[PDB]
Structure formats: structure tokens, C-alpha cells
Design a protein around this ligand. Structure first.
Ligand SMILES: [Ca+2]
Length: 86
């Protein structure tokens, strides 16, 4: 098996209190299927889904982590920086 490769699409800037839409659908497993897309939004919040949403309560800079898992259980991550403005 080869582990998958995580790819996040979504905004790199958003605004406080607004729902930010993220996707992991461009992630790729060369030899199988991605079976889960886990998100850590950098403010303690987590979600799961090929698409996910999060609103940040405070302006600042956050690193979002996407963790993809393939059909064999191998994992990969991406760290993606988002700026949240007032
Ligand atoms: Ca694989």
C-alpha cells in the first residue's frame, strides 16, 4: 500500500463568526480510496467529512489540519493556514 496525500481547498482568509467551508475532495490515494477526512480547525474544534464547515470566534491566524485515512488505514495530513479578520 501507499499512503494517501491530503489536499485542502477552501479560503485562506475569512471573517469572525462566519462559516468557513473546507473541502478535502482533491486529496488522492494512488492505490485505493480515502475513507475518512478528519479536521482540526486550530481552535480546538474537530469535524469529519469530505466537506466541512467551521466558524472562528476570534480573529487571528489558525492552522487547520486535514488528516485523510485510506482503505488500508494509512494516514496523511496537511497543515493549512487561515487568517480570520474582524
Ligand atoms: Ca492507499
Amino acid at each position: 500500500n501507499k499512503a494517501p496525500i491530503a489536499k485542502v481547498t477552501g479560503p485562506s482568509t475569512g471573517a469572525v463568526g462566519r462559516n468557513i467551508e473546507f473541502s478535502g475532495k482533491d486529496s488522492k490515494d494512488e492505490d485505493g480510496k480515502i475513507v475518512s477526512y478528519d479536521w482540526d480547525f486550530g481552535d480546538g474544534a474537530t469535524s469529519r467529512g469530505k466537506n466541512s464547515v467551521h466558524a472562528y470566534k476570534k480573529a487571528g491566524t489558525y492552522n487547520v489540519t486535514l488528516k485523510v485515512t485510506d482503505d488500508k488505514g494509512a494516514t496523511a495530513t496537511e497543515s493549512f493556514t487561515i487568517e480570520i479578520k474582524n
